[PDB]
Each structure stands twice: as C-alpha cells, then as structure tokens.
Amino acid sequence: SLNVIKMKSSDFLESAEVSLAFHRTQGLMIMKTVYKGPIEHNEALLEEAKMMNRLRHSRVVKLLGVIIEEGKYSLVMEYMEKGNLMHVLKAEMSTPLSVKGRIILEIIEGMAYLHGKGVIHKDLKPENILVDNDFHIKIADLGLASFKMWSKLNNEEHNEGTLYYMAPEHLNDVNAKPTEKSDVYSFAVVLWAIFANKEPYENAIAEQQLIMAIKSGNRPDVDDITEYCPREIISLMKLCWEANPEARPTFPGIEEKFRPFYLSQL
Ligand SMILES: COC(=O)c1ccn(Cc2c(Cl)cccc2Cl)n1
C-alpha cells in the first residue's frame, strides 16, 4: 500500500565512509551503496524495496528510501547515533541491568514481528542491532541477507562474516535452509554477549577447531560472565542454543515468558 521514496544523489550533500550521509532537508541518514558500474533489475529492485518498506515496527530499522540511478544503486535507512550493540557494550560506561533487560525485550519484539511477517533474518548478530541515544534498539539487515535482488546486485561481476552466532546446523553445511529456529540460536548467543560485554570464544585457536566444537555441543562460557545475570536469563540462554533446532522455543513463546519477568524484576 505504502510507496518507497525514490531519492536522488543530488538531494544529499556528501556521504562520509555503509556511510553516513546528510540529506539537505532531512538530516542525518545511513546510506548503503550497493552497486557502482554499468538496468534490467531496476524493477525487481524497487519491487523488493516496496516489499521491504512494508515492514514497520518500532524495533526494526526503517528503509527511508532507495537511490536507483544509472550505474548507481543505494539503500537509505535510519541513523542510529550510538552504533551497533557490540560497540555500546564495549564502552566503558556500564549499562545497567534495567537497560539490558529492556534491550533484550525489544530484540524479542522485533524478531517476533519479522517472523510473524514470514521474514527470516538469517544473520542476527550484535552488528545488526543498532542503538540510539536513549538506548533503544532497532534490528537491521546490513548484510542484505533478506534483500534477495539487492544482494544479487551486490555480488554481480561488474560491481566495483562471523560464525559466533550461526546455528551449528549451518556450520560446514551451506545447503541447510535457515529457519526461524536459526534466528533463535543467534538470539541466544546475543543474550550471552549482552551480559559478557564481549564476543564469545576468545580462547579459540583456529576456525576449524571452533566449528567442530560448536557442532559437538560447545557453547559460550557461562562462567565467563562476571556481571550479575538472572537465573531466568541463563535458562533462556541454554534453551535457545540447544543443538536440536526443534527444542528451541519461538520468539512469541520467549516473549510470553520474558515480558512478565522483565516488568516485575528488571
Ligand atoms: C538494507 O539495510 C538494512 O539494514 C535494513 C533496512 C530495513 N531493514 C529491516 C529489515 C530487516 Cl531487519 C530484516 C529483513 C528485512 C528488512 Cl526491510 N534493514
């Protein structure tokens, strides 16, 4: 029903390198230029952008517009001042448990909305969770995982990746189709990183050792969390990173249990 704002490069002053760009009348926006080079896709690209523009939720980043010009293709989206979740977590100012709990609930809210719309994120990770100045979050798709046409354009010939959060069924198996349960596993490791204030598996020596470990049941070190972590969140963590994908809960199921716990205890 709603339409995509078709933007031009002229209404942007300059973009400083994913890049921050100032719109002459609308201010700061994040611009992801996808293609630069030598037209048949301009239709499937804008139709995909119209399909993605429908997703509107307070915890999902808004696609503000698209730039479709000759040999120039970009996506324009909201600007979040504080960066991604890992950048905020590694800052020296400690984030209280009330804010961390609020962030978790908002991640659950945004994930349940995307799944309810049939969208599987496939790349949920702290780099894809952007934070504003009020410590509110919004889920992004900076890798263009769900943008099928725009990712095809990104990987085209004439156009001039962590594993910590991938479900084990996708490690060493590119032919496995990601499901909603794959996003639930990613959420589990994001939960751990929120309380550990860092990335997991710091003591890993080699990528092949890490892959074999996770596939055999190895998980982020819970004892490595020095911060206080509620018993219920550790239980939610271990439930969401179960080896069997059918044992992992759904985000509406996570939402039903976590919201009363957050309101009453956090
Ligand atoms: C393209 O740049 C982005 O990061 C971006 C723009 C809009 N969204 C939200 C979104 C998500 Cl999170 C997952 C799947 C589809 C959509 Cl539309 N992400």
PDB file of C-alpha atoms and ligand atoms in Angstrom:
ATOM      1  CA  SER A   1       0.000   0.000   0.000  1.00  0.00           C
ATOM      2  CA  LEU A   2       2.677   2.487   1.042  1.00  0.00           C
ATOM      3  CA  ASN A   3       5.254   3.560  -1.533  1.00  0.00           C
ATOM      4  CA  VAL A   4       9.036   3.876  -1.429  1.00  0.00           C
ATOM      5  CA  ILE A   5      10.564   7.344  -1.539  1.00  0.00           C
ATOM      6  CA  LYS A   6      12.752   7.337  -4.656  1.00  0.00           C
ATOM      7  CA  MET A   7      15.710   9.542  -3.731  1.00  0.00           C
ATOM      8  CA  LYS A   8      18.434  11.115  -5.856  1.00  0.00           C
ATOM      9  CA  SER A   9      22.114  11.675  -5.126  1.00  0.00           C
ATOM     10  CA  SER A  10      21.565  15.412  -5.663  1.00  0.00           C
ATOM     11  CA  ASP A  11      19.459  15.900  -2.518  1.00  0.00           C
ATOM     12  CA  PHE A  12      22.389  14.558  -0.458  1.00  0.00           C
ATOM     13  CA  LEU A  13      25.306  16.907   0.183  1.00  0.00           C
ATOM     14  CA  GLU A  14      28.051  14.343   0.826  1.00  0.00           C
ATOM     15  CA  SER A  15      28.448  10.859   2.278  1.00  0.00           C
ATOM     16  CA  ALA A  16      31.425  10.119   4.533  1.00  0.00           C
ATOM     17  CA  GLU A  17      32.538   6.481   4.544  1.00  0.00           C
ATOM     18  CA  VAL A  18      27.924   1.760   4.956  1.00  0.00           C
ATOM     19  CA  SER A  19      28.232   5.551   5.086  1.00  0.00           C
ATOM     20  CA  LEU A  20      26.736   8.469   6.975  1.00  0.00           C
ATOM     21  CA  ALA A  21      25.015  10.926   4.632  1.00  0.00           C
ATOM     22  CA  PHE A  22      23.402  14.318   5.233  1.00  0.00           C
ATOM     23  CA  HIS A  23      20.118  14.974   3.454  1.00  0.00           C
ATOM     24  CA  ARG A  24      19.830  18.670   2.629  1.00  0.00           C
ATOM     25  CA  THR A  25      16.322  18.916   4.117  1.00  0.00           C
ATOM     26  CA  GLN A  26      16.019  15.797   6.309  1.00  0.00           C
ATOM     27  CA  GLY A  27      19.341  15.494   8.149  1.00  0.00           C
ATOM     28  CA  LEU A  28      21.491  12.502   9.037  1.00  0.00           C
ATOM     29  CA  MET A  29      20.811   9.122   7.421  1.00  0.00           C
ATOM     30  CA  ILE A  30      22.754   5.897   6.881  1.00  0.00           C
ATOM     31  CA  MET A  31      23.410   5.096   3.215  1.00  0.00           C
ATOM     32  CA  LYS A  32      24.479   1.677   1.921  1.00  0.00           C
ATOM     33  CA  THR A  33      25.686   1.931  -1.668  1.00  0.00           C
ATOM     34  CA  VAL A  34      25.268  -1.495  -3.248  1.00  0.00           C
ATOM     35  CA  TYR A  35      26.366  -1.079  -6.889  1.00  0.00           C
ATOM     36  CA  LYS A  36      28.636   1.125  -8.989  1.00  0.00           C
ATOM     37  CA  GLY A  37      29.289   0.312 -12.636  1.00  0.00           C
ATOM     38  CA  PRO A  38      27.382  -0.319 -15.892  1.00  0.00           C
ATOM     39  CA  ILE A  39      19.106  -1.527 -15.785  1.00  0.00           C
ATOM     40  CA  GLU A  40      17.048  -4.686 -16.290  1.00  0.00           C
ATOM     41  CA  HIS A  41      16.915  -5.039 -12.489  1.00  0.00           C
ATOM     42  CA  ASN A  42      15.580  -1.539 -11.710  1.00  0.00           C
ATOM     43  CA  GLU A  43      12.068  -3.036 -11.494  1.00  0.00           C
ATOM     44  CA  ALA A  44      12.722  -6.151  -9.395  1.00  0.00           C
ATOM     45  CA  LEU A  45      14.913  -3.969  -7.170  1.00  0.00           C
ATOM     46  CA  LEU A  46      12.226  -1.369  -6.466  1.00  0.00           C
ATOM     47  CA  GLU A  47       9.567  -4.071  -6.080  1.00  0.00           C
ATOM     48  CA  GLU A  48      11.783  -5.768  -3.492  1.00  0.00           C
ATOM     49  CA  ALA A  49      12.266  -2.379  -1.828  1.00  0.00           C
ATOM     50  CA  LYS A  50       8.489  -1.919  -1.745  1.00  0.00           C
ATOM     51  CA  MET A  51       8.150  -5.377  -0.170  1.00  0.00           C
ATOM     52  CA  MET A  52      10.717  -4.428   2.485  1.00  0.00           C
ATOM     53  CA  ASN A  53       9.247  -0.959   3.065  1.00  0.00           C
ATOM     54  CA  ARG A  54       6.075  -2.613   4.405  1.00  0.00           C
ATOM     55  CA  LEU A  55       7.910  -3.916   7.483  1.00  0.00           C
ATOM     56  CA  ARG A  56       7.162  -1.208  10.050  1.00  0.00           C
ATOM     57  CA  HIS A  57       7.911  -1.760  13.738  1.00  0.00           C
ATOM     58  CA  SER A  58       9.471   0.381  16.448  1.00  0.00           C
ATOM     59  CA  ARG A  59      12.309  -2.160  16.855  1.00  0.00           C
ATOM     60  CA  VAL A  60      13.122  -2.602  13.144  1.00  0.00           C
ATOM     61  CA  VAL A  61      15.101  -0.028  11.169  1.00  0.00           C
ATOM     62  CA  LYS A  62      13.070   1.890   8.592  1.00  0.00           C
ATOM     63  CA  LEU A  63      14.033   1.868   4.918  1.00  0.00           C
ATOM     64  CA  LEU A  64      13.722   5.597   4.283  1.00  0.00           C
ATOM     65  CA  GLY A  65      14.368   5.443   0.544  1.00  0.00           C
ATOM     66  CA  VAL A  66      16.258   3.989  -2.388  1.00  0.00           C
ATOM     67  CA  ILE A  67      18.612   5.573  -4.916  1.00  0.00           C
ATOM     68  CA  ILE A  68      18.167   3.981  -8.350  1.00  0.00           C
ATOM     69  CA  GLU A  69      20.282   5.829 -10.932  1.00  0.00           C
ATOM     70  CA  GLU A  70      22.354   4.806 -13.953  1.00  0.00           C
ATOM     71  CA  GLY A  71      25.063   2.523 -12.602  1.00  0.00           C
ATOM     72  CA  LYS A  72      24.371   3.767  -9.056  1.00  0.00           C
ATOM     73  CA  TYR A  73      22.250   1.842  -6.552  1.00  0.00           C
ATOM     74  CA  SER A  74      21.925   2.568  -2.837  1.00  0.00           C
ATOM     75  CA  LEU A  75      19.652   1.953   0.133  1.00  0.00           C
ATOM     76  CA  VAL A  76      18.901   4.740   2.620  1.00  0.00           C
ATOM     77  CA  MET A  77      17.889   3.916   6.190  1.00  0.00           C
ATOM     78  CA  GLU A  78      17.567   5.477   9.638  1.00  0.00           C
ATOM     79  CA  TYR A  79      20.561   6.839  11.538  1.00  0.00           C
ATOM     80  CA  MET A  80      21.284   5.402  14.992  1.00  0.00           C
ATOM     81  CA  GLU A  81      23.707   7.582  16.916  1.00  0.00           C
ATOM     82  CA  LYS A  82      25.351   5.039  19.228  1.00  0.00           C
ATOM     83  CA  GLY A  83      26.204   2.422  16.586  1.00  0.00           C
ATOM     84  CA  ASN A  84      25.730  -1.328  16.943  1.00  0.00           C
ATOM     85  CA  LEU A  85      25.151  -3.302  20.133  1.00  0.00           C
ATOM     86  CA  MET A  86      28.732  -4.558  20.460  1.00  0.00           C
ATOM     87  CA  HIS A  87      30.108  -1.011  20.261  1.00  0.00           C
ATOM     88  CA  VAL A  88      27.775   0.090  23.066  1.00  0.00           C
ATOM     89  CA  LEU A  89      28.546  -2.994  25.171  1.00  0.00           C
ATOM     90  CA  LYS A  90      32.316  -2.478  24.919  1.00  0.00           C
ATOM     91  CA  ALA A  91      32.075   1.155  26.058  1.00  0.00           C
ATOM     92  CA  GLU A  92      33.491   1.979  29.477  1.00  0.00           C
ATOM     93  CA  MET A  93      30.203   3.295  30.878  1.00  0.00           C
ATOM     94  CA  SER A  94      28.453   0.223  32.256  1.00  0.00           C
ATOM     95  CA  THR A  95      24.919  -0.497  31.071  1.00  0.00           C
ATOM     96  CA  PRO A  96      22.563  -1.270  33.984  1.00  0.00           C
ATOM     97  CA  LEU A  97      20.501  -4.441  34.183  1.00  0.00           C
ATOM     98  CA  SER A  98      17.279  -2.493  33.584  1.00  0.00           C
ATOM     99  CA  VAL A  99      18.544  -1.191  30.235  1.00  0.00           C
ATOM    100  CA  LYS A 100      19.998  -4.569  29.242  1.00  0.00           C
ATOM    101  CA  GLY A 101      16.683  -6.247  30.033  1.00  0.00           C
ATOM    102  CA  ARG A 102      14.808  -3.628  28.018  1.00  0.00           C
ATOM    103  CA  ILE A 103      17.133  -4.232  25.060  1.00  0.00           C
ATOM    104  CA  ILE A 104      16.504  -7.987  25.223  1.00  0.00           C
ATOM    105  CA  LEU A 105      12.734  -7.466  25.257  1.00  0.00           C
ATOM    106  CA  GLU A 106      12.968  -5.134  22.256  1.00  0.00           C
ATOM    107  CA  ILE A 107      15.078  -7.664  20.342  1.00  0.00           C
ATOM    108  CA  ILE A 108      12.399 -10.261  21.110  1.00  0.00           C
ATOM    109  CA  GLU A 109       9.674  -7.851  19.981  1.00  0.00           C
ATOM    110  CA  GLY A 110      11.377  -7.061  16.677  1.00  0.00           C
ATOM    111  CA  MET A 111      12.213 -10.705  15.988  1.00  0.00           C
ATOM    112  CA  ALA A 112       8.628 -11.804  16.659  1.00  0.00           C
ATOM    113  CA  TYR A 113       7.324  -9.143  14.263  1.00  0.00           C
ATOM    114  CA  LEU A 114       9.650 -10.202  11.437  1.00  0.00           C
ATOM    115  CA  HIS A 115       8.810 -13.885  11.924  1.00  0.00           C
ATOM    116  CA  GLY A 116       5.097 -13.093  12.084  1.00  0.00           C
ATOM    117  CA  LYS A 117       5.504 -11.423   8.689  1.00  0.00           C
ATOM    118  CA  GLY A 118       7.274 -14.531   7.360  1.00  0.00           C
ATOM    119  CA  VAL A 119      10.706 -12.869   7.229  1.00  0.00           C
ATOM    120  CA  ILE A 120      13.646 -14.964   8.436  1.00  0.00           C
ATOM    121  CA  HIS A 121      16.567 -12.698   9.314  1.00  0.00           C
ATOM    122  CA  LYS A 122      19.320 -15.346   8.791  1.00  0.00           C
ATOM    123  CA  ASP A 123      22.045 -13.022  10.173  1.00  0.00           C
ATOM    124  CA  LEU A 124      21.057 -11.850  13.658  1.00  0.00           C
ATOM    125  CA  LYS A 125      24.166 -10.585  15.460  1.00  0.00           C
ATOM    126  CA  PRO A 126      25.218  -7.549  17.541  1.00  0.00           C
ATOM    127  CA  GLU A 127      26.479  -5.824  14.387  1.00  0.00           C
ATOM    128  CA  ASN A 128      22.865  -5.893  13.132  1.00  0.00           C
ATOM    129  CA  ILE A 129      21.346  -4.392  16.311  1.00  0.00           C
ATOM    130  CA  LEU A 130      21.642  -0.596  16.230  1.00  0.00           C
ATOM    131  CA  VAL A 131      21.213   1.624  19.292  1.00  0.00           C
ATOM    132  CA  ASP A 132      20.085   5.244  19.583  1.00  0.00           C
ATOM    133  CA  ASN A 133      20.938   7.756  22.310  1.00  0.00           C
ATOM    134  CA  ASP A 134      18.046   6.600  24.528  1.00  0.00           C
ATOM    135  CA  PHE A 135      19.441   3.018  24.478  1.00  0.00           C
ATOM    136  CA  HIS A 136      16.525   1.846  22.329  1.00  0.00           C
ATOM    137  CA  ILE A 137      17.421  -0.680  19.648  1.00  0.00           C
ATOM    138  CA  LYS A 138      16.363  -1.481  16.096  1.00  0.00           C
ATOM    139  CA  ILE A 139      17.151  -4.623  14.099  1.00  0.00           C
ATOM    140  CA  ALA A 140      18.887  -4.082  10.752  1.00  0.00           C
ATOM    141  CA  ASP A 141      19.890  -6.238   7.776  1.00  0.00           C
ATOM    142  CA  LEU A 142      23.232  -4.653   6.907  1.00  0.00           C
ATOM    143  CA  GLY A 143      24.453  -7.784   5.146  1.00  0.00           C
ATOM    144  CA  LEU A 144      21.428  -7.690   2.810  1.00  0.00           C
ATOM    145  CA  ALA A 145      20.601 -11.254   3.838  1.00  0.00           C
ATOM    146  CA  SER A 146      16.860 -10.853   3.208  1.00  0.00           C
ATOM    147  CA  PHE A 147      17.274  -8.484   0.219  1.00  0.00           C
ATOM    148  CA  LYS A 148      17.444 -11.165  -2.464  1.00  0.00           C
ATOM    149  CA  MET A 149      17.559  -8.898  -5.533  1.00  0.00           C
ATOM    150  CA  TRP A 150      19.776  -6.277  -3.891  1.00  0.00           C
ATOM    151  CA  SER A 151      22.211  -8.974  -2.747  1.00  0.00           C
ATOM    152  CA  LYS A 152      22.293 -10.420  -6.268  1.00  0.00           C
ATOM    153  CA  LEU A 153      23.160  -6.890  -7.400  1.00  0.00           C
ATOM    154  CA  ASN A 154      25.832  -6.633  -4.695  1.00  0.00           C
ATOM    155  CA  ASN A 155      27.584  -9.825  -5.834  1.00  0.00           C
ATOM    156  CA  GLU A 156      27.396  -9.036  -9.555  1.00  0.00           C
ATOM    157  CA  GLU A 157      30.617  -9.201 -11.548  1.00  0.00           C
ATOM    158  CA  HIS A 158      30.777  -5.628 -12.879  1.00  0.00           C
ATOM    159  CA  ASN A 159      30.194  -4.071  -9.427  1.00  0.00           C
ATOM    160  CA  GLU A 160      33.421  -2.450  -8.236  1.00  0.00           C
ATOM    161  CA  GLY A 161      31.095 -12.775   8.228  1.00  0.00           C
ATOM    162  CA  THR A 162      31.479 -14.052  11.774  1.00  0.00           C
ATOM    163  CA  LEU A 163      30.426 -17.549  12.839  1.00  0.00           C
ATOM    164  CA  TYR A 164      29.913 -16.918  16.570  1.00  0.00           C
ATOM    165  CA  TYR A 165      26.148 -16.514  16.118  1.00  0.00           C
ATOM    166  CA  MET A 166      25.419 -19.080  13.390  1.00  0.00           C
ATOM    167  CA  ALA A 167      23.359 -22.104  14.358  1.00  0.00           C
ATOM    168  CA  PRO A 168      25.525 -25.261  14.293  1.00  0.00           C
ATOM    169  CA  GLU A 169      23.418 -26.874  11.548  1.00  0.00           C
ATOM    170  CA  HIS A 170      24.705 -24.138   9.206  1.00  0.00           C
ATOM    171  CA  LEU A 171      28.392 -24.562  10.061  1.00  0.00           C
ATOM    172  CA  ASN A 172      30.095 -26.730   7.414  1.00  0.00           C
ATOM    173  CA  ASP A 173      26.722 -27.074   5.646  1.00  0.00           C
ATOM    174  CA  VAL A 174      25.817 -24.304   3.187  1.00  0.00           C
ATOM    175  CA  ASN A 175      22.880 -26.301   1.781  1.00  0.00           C
ATOM    176  CA  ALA A 176      20.867 -26.131   5.017  1.00  0.00           C
ATOM    177  CA  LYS A 177      17.988 -23.670   4.663  1.00  0.00           C
ATOM    178  CA  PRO A 178      17.825 -21.185   7.573  1.00  0.00           C
ATOM    179  CA  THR A 179      14.629 -21.326   9.627  1.00  0.00           C
ATOM    180  CA  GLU A 180      13.080 -19.326  12.446  1.00  0.00           C
ATOM    181  CA  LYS A 181      14.949 -21.640  14.829  1.00  0.00           C
ATOM    182  CA  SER A 182      18.220 -20.443  13.289  1.00  0.00           C
ATOM    183  CA  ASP A 183      17.375 -16.903  14.412  1.00  0.00           C
ATOM    184  CA  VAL A 184      16.542 -18.239  17.884  1.00  0.00           C
ATOM    185  CA  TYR A 185      20.049 -19.688  18.228  1.00  0.00           C
ATOM    186  CA  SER A 186      21.583 -16.375  17.153  1.00  0.00           C
ATOM    187  CA  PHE A 187      19.461 -14.632  19.785  1.00  0.00           C
ATOM    188  CA  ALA A 188      20.860 -16.992  22.437  1.00  0.00           C
ATOM    189  CA  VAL A 189      24.471 -16.005  21.754  1.00  0.00           C
ATOM    190  CA  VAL A 190      23.441 -12.339  21.601  1.00  0.00           C
ATOM    191  CA  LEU A 191      21.947 -12.850  25.072  1.00  0.00           C
ATOM    192  CA  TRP A 192      25.312 -14.128  26.310  1.00  0.00           C
ATOM    193  CA  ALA A 193      27.219 -11.250  24.705  1.00  0.00           C
ATOM    194  CA  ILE A 194      24.885  -8.701  26.321  1.00  0.00           C
ATOM    195  CA  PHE A 195      25.911  -9.861  29.802  1.00  0.00           C
ATOM    196  CA  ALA A 196      29.522 -10.769  28.973  1.00  0.00           C
ATOM    197  CA  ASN A 197      30.095  -7.366  27.292  1.00  0.00           C
ATOM    198  CA  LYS A 198      32.224  -9.026  24.593  1.00  0.00           C
ATOM    199  CA  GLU A 199      32.321 -11.611  21.817  1.00  0.00           C
ATOM    200  CA  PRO A 200      32.354 -15.334  22.668  1.00  0.00           C
ATOM    201  CA  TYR A 201      35.112 -17.895  22.132  1.00  0.00           C
ATOM    202  CA  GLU A 202      38.083 -15.630  22.824  1.00  0.00           C
ATOM    203  CA  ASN A 203      40.284 -18.651  23.626  1.00  0.00           C
ATOM    204  CA  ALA A 204      39.625 -20.387  20.291  1.00  0.00           C
ATOM    205  CA  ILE A 205      42.794 -21.140  18.329  1.00  0.00           C
ATOM    206  CA  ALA A 206      41.558 -21.913  14.805  1.00  0.00           C
ATOM    207  CA  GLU A 207      38.335 -21.651  12.819  1.00  0.00           C
ATOM    208  CA  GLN A 208      38.169 -25.399  12.168  1.00  0.00           C
ATOM    209  CA  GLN A 209      38.580 -26.096  15.890  1.00  0.00           C
ATOM    210  CA  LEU A 210      35.759 -23.656  16.674  1.00  0.00           C
ATOM    211  CA  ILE A 211      33.379 -25.168  14.106  1.00  0.00           C
ATOM    212  CA  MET A 212      33.933 -28.733  15.319  1.00  0.00           C
ATOM    213  CA  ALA A 213      33.499 -27.606  18.930  1.00  0.00           C
ATOM    214  CA  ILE A 214      30.164 -25.846  18.388  1.00  0.00           C
ATOM    215  CA  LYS A 215      28.824 -28.696  16.245  1.00  0.00           C
ATOM    216  CA  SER A 216      29.698 -31.131  19.056  1.00  0.00           C
ATOM    217  CA  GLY A 217      27.844 -29.073  21.685  1.00  0.00           C
ATOM    218  CA  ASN A 218      30.363 -26.444  22.807  1.00  0.00           C
ATOM    219  CA  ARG A 219      28.768 -23.121  23.766  1.00  0.00           C
ATOM    220  CA  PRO A 220      29.861 -19.715  25.085  1.00  0.00           C
ATOM    221  CA  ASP A 221      31.334 -19.938  28.579  1.00  0.00           C
ATOM    222  CA  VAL A 222      28.581 -19.054  31.051  1.00  0.00           C
ATOM    223  CA  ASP A 223      31.113 -18.869  33.896  1.00  0.00           C
ATOM    224  CA  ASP A 224      32.898 -16.151  31.894  1.00  0.00           C
ATOM    225  CA  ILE A 225      30.037 -13.761  32.756  1.00  0.00           C
ATOM    226  CA  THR A 226      31.355 -11.748  35.705  1.00  0.00           C
ATOM    227  CA  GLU A 227      28.372  -9.382  35.693  1.00  0.00           C
ATOM    228  CA  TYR A 228      25.221 -10.415  37.523  1.00  0.00           C
ATOM    229  CA  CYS A 229      22.928 -12.492  35.302  1.00  0.00           C
ATOM    230  CA  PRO A 230      19.420 -13.550  36.403  1.00  0.00           C
ATOM    231  CA  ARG A 231      18.830 -17.289  36.673  1.00  0.00           C
ATOM    232  CA  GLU A 232      15.906 -16.964  34.250  1.00  0.00           C
ATOM    233  CA  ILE A 233      18.059 -15.396  31.521  1.00  0.00           C
ATOM    234  CA  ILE A 234      20.708 -18.122  31.796  1.00  0.00           C
ATOM    235  CA  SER A 235      17.919 -20.692  31.464  1.00  0.00           C
ATOM    236  CA  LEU A 236      16.546 -18.837  28.431  1.00  0.00           C
ATOM    237  CA  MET A 237      20.086 -18.760  27.019  1.00  0.00           C
ATOM    238  CA  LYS A 238      20.652 -22.506  27.351  1.00  0.00           C
ATOM    239  CA  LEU A 239      17.177 -23.259  25.993  1.00  0.00           C
ATOM    240  CA  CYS A 240      17.649 -21.148  22.855  1.00  0.00           C
ATOM    241  CA  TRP A 241      21.068 -22.547  21.853  1.00  0.00           C
ATOM    242  CA  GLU A 242      20.041 -26.207  22.078  1.00  0.00           C
ATOM    243  CA  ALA A 243      21.713 -28.417  19.480  1.00  0.00           C
ATOM    244  CA  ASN A 244      18.356 -29.722  18.249  1.00  0.00           C
ATOM    245  CA  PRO A 245      16.551 -26.861  16.439  1.00  0.00           C
ATOM    246  CA  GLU A 246      13.119 -28.271  17.310  1.00  0.00           C
ATOM    247  CA  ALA A 247      13.962 -27.934  21.015  1.00  0.00           C
ATOM    248  CA  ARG A 248      14.451 -24.165  20.679  1.00  0.00           C
ATOM    249  CA  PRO A 249      11.401 -22.038  21.543  1.00  0.00           C
ATOM    250  CA  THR A 250       9.768 -19.439  19.322  1.00  0.00           C
ATOM    251  CA  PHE A 251      10.035 -15.689  19.811  1.00  0.00           C
ATOM    252  CA  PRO A 252       6.323 -15.377  20.753  1.00  0.00           C
ATOM    253  CA  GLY A 253       6.959 -18.107  23.318  1.00  0.00           C
ATOM    254  CA  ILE A 254      10.053 -16.262  24.532  1.00  0.00           C
ATOM    255  CA  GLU A 255       8.040 -13.030  24.626  1.00  0.00           C
ATOM    256  CA  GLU A 256       5.226 -14.517  26.723  1.00  0.00           C
ATOM    257  CA  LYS A 257       7.661 -15.665  29.431  1.00  0.00           C
ATOM    258  CA  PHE A 258      10.172 -12.801  29.419  1.00  0.00           C
ATOM    259  CA  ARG A 259       7.846  -9.778  29.499  1.00  0.00           C
ATOM    260  CA  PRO A 260       6.318 -10.572  32.938  1.00  0.00           C
ATOM    261  CA  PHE A 261       9.805 -11.302  34.278  1.00  0.00           C
ATOM    262  CA  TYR A 262      11.156  -8.022  32.894  1.00  0.00           C
ATOM    263  CA  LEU A 263       8.299  -5.886  34.230  1.00  0.00           C
ATOM    264  CA  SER A 264       8.334  -7.464  37.695  1.00  0.00           C
ATOM    265  CA  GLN A 265      12.076  -7.925  38.306  1.00  0.00           C
ATOM    266  CA  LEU A 266      14.005  -5.594  35.971  1.00  0.00           C
TER     267      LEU A 266
HETATM  268  C1  LIG B   1      19.026  -2.586   3.867  1.00  0.00           C
HETATM  269  O1  LIG B   1      19.589  -2.074   5.104  1.00  0.00           O
HETATM  270  C2  LIG B   1      19.109  -2.558   6.268  1.00  0.00           C
HETATM  271  O2  LIG B   1      19.886  -2.934   7.123  1.00  0.00           O
HETATM  272  C3  LIG B   1      17.657  -2.612   6.540  1.00  0.00           C
HETATM  273  C4  LIG B   1      16.660  -1.738   6.040  1.00  0.00           C
HETATM  274  C5  LIG B   1      15.496  -2.173   6.570  1.00  0.00           C
HETATM  275  N1  LIG B   1      15.782  -3.241   7.345  1.00  0.00           N
HETATM  276  C6  LIG B   1      14.790  -4.004   8.108  1.00  0.00           C
HETATM  277  C7  LIG B   1      14.739  -5.437   7.647  1.00  0.00           C
HETATM  278  C8  LIG B   1      15.267  -6.444   8.434  1.00  0.00           C
HETATM  279 CL1  LIG B   1      15.996  -6.069   9.964  1.00  0.00          CL
HETATM  280  C9  LIG B   1      15.214  -7.759   8.004  1.00  0.00           C
HETATM  281  C10 LIG B   1      14.634  -8.064   6.787  1.00  0.00           C
HETATM  282  C11 LIG B   1      14.106  -7.058   6.000  1.00  0.00           C
HETATM  283  C12 LIG B   1      14.158  -5.745   6.431  1.00  0.00           C
HETATM  284 CL2  LIG B   1      13.495  -4.480   5.445  1.00  0.00          CL
HETATM  285  N2  LIG B   1      17.044  -3.479   7.325  1.00  0.00           N
END
